[PDB]
């Protein structure tokens, strides 16, 4: 009304290879011998960077691995060859028909070789113990692919955990994950050994980090 | 040239939401000056503009809720959004359209606003120190509201080896952590500090990662 519809919803491209992302418009975005359809890249935490303007012109400062074709209701952004900085969502924008809209985005994921996670465990700070609480934290860092699992074991035995995942890294295409077990200073003080176990496609068996209070 | 959004990062249901964009070094009588929103779900929405003549254009659905005004002097333009609801939570951007591109080419960094009747709580920051050639340190940022929080290492000088994880809500409060990985001979041979900021509660915290 207009509606822009991108395709596919998500794709996974190997470093070096070709990404192509479609944007169909509801009705023509043409005016004065020009397609008023523009491309954008957005990464988590930052705003969209203008990629391609008026369908085919590359914006100042933007690489040339990035190409924009198409004409009326039919547009294509091509990324060739894909490098690691390109993991991101891509939006098409139209600003010539009432009302202005963006497409629903396409999520470009880079493909790379399987990689095992660096795991690290951290006791609670004394600052936190000064007050009533004790948090223990594991970082599971720089692994591929995203899928992964964590287990917490206290004095051997398997509530209080909170999990967060990064988006694909923009230099090495990894994902990382953080995990943090939370307790009371008294309940933590009642036990000695503390352990998180990371399991992932990359190895048949779990990577294991631990310490004793 | 340069855009900066600013305003309350926390506004209550039914109140007016109000933001300011600041333009440094080219006149807001030179272009089209826009507000765009991004929802937690990630969809983008165009909001409107004031053109350089003081001529405005509104997203039809926002027509009666939205104002865009300017101050010719300050080189800054304003967004007013009435009768705010939980679905107005978004990170808001101001941005520019030049005759050069006819596209949205200059983007402010954005500013998160959360519409919620919960109450600002500042974070607690805790150093994360070990209990190899590479060493991994962290900062735990626990128990705050609303988003956002920024985190840096040694004022941004350290940046390559850093993971800052997205916050996670639980029982009305957020927690977040950040990891950094250095040569295990640039620490503790050299100080490493995390710099947490939570503008909403005006908190600014440096924490030195101390061994043992």
| CATH code of the domain containing B51 | 2.60.40.10
Pair B83, B128 in one domain: no
Enter the resolution in angstroms: 2.7
The reply to whether B43 and B55 lie within a common domain is yes
Q: Do B124 and B196 sit in the same domain of this protein?
A: yes
Please give the backbone phi and psi of residue B155, each rounded to the nearest 5 degrees, phi first.
50, 20
Residue B207 three-state SS? strand
User: Can you tell me whether residue A84 is helix, strand or coil?
Assistant: helix
The reply to whether B166 and B73 lie within a common domain is: no
Q: Please check whether residues B163 and B112 belong to one and the same domain.
A: no
Which of B42, B124, B176 comes nearest A89 by C-beta? B42
- Cα–Cα distance between B162 and A139 in angstroms, integer? 11
Q: Are residues B144 and B52 in the same domain?
A: no
| Closest residue in B to A56 (Cα–Cα) | B101
Nearest CA in chain A to B134: A118
Do B44 and A47 lie within an 8 Å CB cutoff? no
Same domain for B129 and B74: no
Smallest Cβ–Cβ distance between A99 and the set B59, B126, B175 belongs to: B59
Both tokens assigned to B44: 């983008």
CA distance A28 to A26: 7
Is B94 exposed, middle or buried, given 0-12, 13-18 or 19+ CB atoms closer than 10 A? buried
Does one domain contain both B15 and B101? yes
Q: Are residues B8 and B103 in the same domain?
A: yes
Q: Strand locations in B41-167, DSSP E?
A: 44-51, 56-58, 66-71, 76-81, 90-97, 104-107, 111-115, 124-128, 134-144, 150-153, 162-164
- Comparing CA positions, the residue from B29, B73, B81 lying closest to residue B50 is B29
* B36 in Cβ contact with B104 (< 8 Å): yes
Is residue A82 within 8 A of residue A41, CB to CB? The reply is no
Mapping DSSP onto H, E and C, the string for A91-157 reads EEEECCCCCCEECCCEEEEEECCCECCEEEEECCCHHHHHCCEEEEEEEEEEEECCCCEEEEEECCE
Nearest to A196 by CA among A143, A144, A142, A140: A140
Count of domains forming chain B: 2
Q: How many CA atoms lie within 13 A of A185 on its CB side?
A: 9
In whole angstroms, give the CA distance from residue A105 to residue B39. 13
Tokens of B114: 């959360």
Q: Same structural domain for residues B76 and B135?
A: no
What residue numbers bound the domain in which B209 lies? 118-212
Q: What DSSP character marks residue B25?
A: S
What distance in Å separates residue B169's CA from the closest CA in chain A? Answer: 9
Could you give all domains of chain A from N- to C-terminal order, each with its CATH number? 1-112 (2.60.40.10), 113-213 (2.60.40.10)
Count of A–B CB contacts within 8 Å?
Answer: 135
Q: Single out the residue in B117, B134, B153 at which a domain terminates.
A: B117
Contact B128, B139 (CB under 8 A): yes
Closest by CA position to A120, among listed A101, A103, A102, A142: A142
How close, in Å, is residue A121 to chain B by CA atoms?
A: 7
Could B46 and A120 be called an inter-chain contact, meaning their C-beta atoms sit closer than 8 Å? no
Cα-trace Rg, chain A = 23
Closest approach of B3 to chain A, Cα-based (Å) = 12
Pairing of strands A10-14, A106-111: parallel
**CA distance, residue A39 to nearest chain B CA (Å):** 9
Token pair of B186, please?
């640039």
């Amino acid at each position: 009304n207009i509606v822009l519809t991108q395709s596919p919803v998500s794709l996974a491209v190997s470093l070096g290879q070709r990404a192509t992302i479609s944007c169909r418009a509801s009705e023509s975005v043409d005016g004065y011998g020009n397609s008023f359809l523009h491309w954008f890249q957005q990464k988590p935490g930052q705003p969209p960077k203008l990629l391609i303007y008026l369908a085919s012109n590359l914006n100042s400062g933007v690489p040339a691995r990035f190409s924009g074709s198409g004409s009326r209701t039919d547009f294509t952004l091509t990324i060739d060859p894909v490098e690691a900085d390109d993991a991101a969502t891509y939006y098409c924008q139209q600003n010539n028909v009432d009302p202005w809209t963006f497409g629903g985005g396409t999520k470009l994921e880079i493909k790379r070789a399987d990689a095992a996670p660096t795991v690290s465990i951290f006791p609670p700070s004394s600052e936190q113990l000064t007050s009533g609480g004790a948090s223990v934290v594991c970082f599971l860092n720089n692994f591929y692919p995203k899928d992964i699992n964590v287990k917490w074991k206290i004095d051997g035995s398997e509530n209080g955990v909170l999990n967060s995942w990064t988006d694909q890294d923009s230099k090495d295409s990894t994902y990382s994950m953080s995990s943090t077990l939370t307790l009371t200073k008294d309940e933590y003080e009642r036990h000695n050994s503390y352990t998180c176990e990371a399991t992932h496609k990359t190895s048949t068996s779990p990577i294991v980090k631990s310490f004793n209070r | 040239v340069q855009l900066q959004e600013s305003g309350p990062s926390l506004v209550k249901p039914s109140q007016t939401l109000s933001l300011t964009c600041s333009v440094t070094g080219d006149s807001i009588t030179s272009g089209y000056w826009n507000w765009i929103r991004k929802f937690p779900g990630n969809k983008l929405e165009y909001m409107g503009y004031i053109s350089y003549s003081g001529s405005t254009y509104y997203n039809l659905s926002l027509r009666s809720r939205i104002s865009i005004t300017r101050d010719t002097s300050k080189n800054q333009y304003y967004l007013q959004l009435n009768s705010v609801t939980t679905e107005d939570t978004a990170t808001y951007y101001c941005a520019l359209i030049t005759t050069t591109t006819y596209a949205m080419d200059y983007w402010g960094q954005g500013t998160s606003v959360t519409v919620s009747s919960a109450k600002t709580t500042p974070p607690s920051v805790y150093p994360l120190a070990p209990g190899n050639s590479m060493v991994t340190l962290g900062c735990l940022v626990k128990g705050y509201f609303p988003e956002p929080v920024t985190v840096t290492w040694n004022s941004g000088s350290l940046s390559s080896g850093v993971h800052t994880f997205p916050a996670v809500l639980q029982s009305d409060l957020y927690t977040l952590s950040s990891s950094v990985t250095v040569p295990s001979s640039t620490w503790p041979s050299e100080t490493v500090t995390c710099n947490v900021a939570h503008p909403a509660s005006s908190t600014k915290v440096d924490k030195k990662i101390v061994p043992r």
